[PDB]
């Protein structure tokens, strides 16, 4: 089946998605094609009252100027869109950034949200990467992960624990051996979506998975991340292990194929909604 047959039914039933979406979102997006289907899956259609609000927005001025500009000098700075300090690149990133931190009057900009405003503006019109920004915040429930000092991020490291408790118990016998707990490696895998440390390529296929079924898929990927580097975790020690996830497991994803399996097995790795309501049941009582 094909993103030219798929893509030609969306067109035609705005409001609906086409069968065998999955499947195909699953093997990844054509580069080509995903401003496009980023901005279909996201359910966002060349909005009018967006634009004129977002030119509104960059109008406005900040609290978090040094929150943003920090993050900004670090965000993909190696790539030649982002290389240059007074590039266009990075005008347009701040703007975005700048722009959310007004639009959102609770929680504000946070901290490594600009590495997921890149990856959309490598993609897409700086004000389209906004209203993309705003839909993975606001309507997938990414911003909730930082509301309340994080209750619901905990929440989440629980449930991890658990799955792995589950599904891959000697690597939590040795986790728990040393006392490596997930809030110590895990925190920008969620709240950044990877965009934090792991390679483009890898993280444009993960923003494919997320926009089309949701934020439950970094459970996925962080569940294929620890079972295929079992090996390399299990001989490691708590500082070794660190290491690893911050430094040497993101290197091994920079290629296009080593990309492509690793979301197959994040597709084949199962995580009933069933079994993250428990768990998350059994958090909530906790406190």
Request: net charge neutral; aromatic share 12%; with cysteine.
């Amino acid at each position: 089946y094909s993103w030219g047959e798929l893509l030609g039914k969306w067109h035609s039933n705005l409001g609906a998605r086409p069968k065998g979406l999955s499947t195909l979102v699953k093997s990844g997006v054509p580069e080509a094609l995903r401003a496009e289907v980023w901005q279909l899956l996201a359910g966002c259609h060349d909005n009018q009252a967006m634009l004129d609000r977002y030119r509104i927005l960059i109008t406005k001025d900040s609290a978090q100027e040094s929150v943003i500009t920090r993050d900004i000098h670090r965000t993909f700075p190696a790539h030649d869109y982002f290389k240059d300090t007074g590039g266009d690149g990075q005008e347009s990133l701040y703007k975005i950034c700048k722009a959310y931190s007004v639009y959102d009057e609770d929680i504000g900009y946070c901290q490594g949200q600009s590495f997921l405003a890149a990856v959309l503006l490598l993609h897409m019109p700086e004000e389209q990467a906004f209203c993309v920004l705003v839909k993975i915040m606001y309507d997938y429930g990414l911003r909730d992960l930082y509301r309340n000092n994080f209750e619901d991020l905990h929440c989440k490291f629980y449930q991890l624990e658990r799955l792995m408790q589950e599904q891959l118990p000697d690597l939590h016998s040795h986790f728990s051996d040393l006392n490596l707990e997930a809030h110590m490696y895990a925190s920008q895998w969620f709240l950044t979506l990877f965009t934090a440390k792991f390679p483009l390529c890898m993280v444009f296929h993960i923003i494919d998975l997320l926009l089309c079924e949701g934020l439950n898929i970094i459970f996925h990927v962080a569940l294929a991340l620890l079972k295929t580097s079992k090996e390399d975790l299990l001989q490691a020690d708590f500082e070794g292990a660190l290491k690893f996830f911050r430094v040497q497991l993101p290197k091994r994803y920079r290629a296009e194929e080593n990309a492509r399996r690793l979301m197959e097995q994040a597709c084949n790795i199962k995580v009933p909604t069933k079994k993250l309501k428990k768990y998350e049941k059994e958090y909530q009582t906790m406190r």
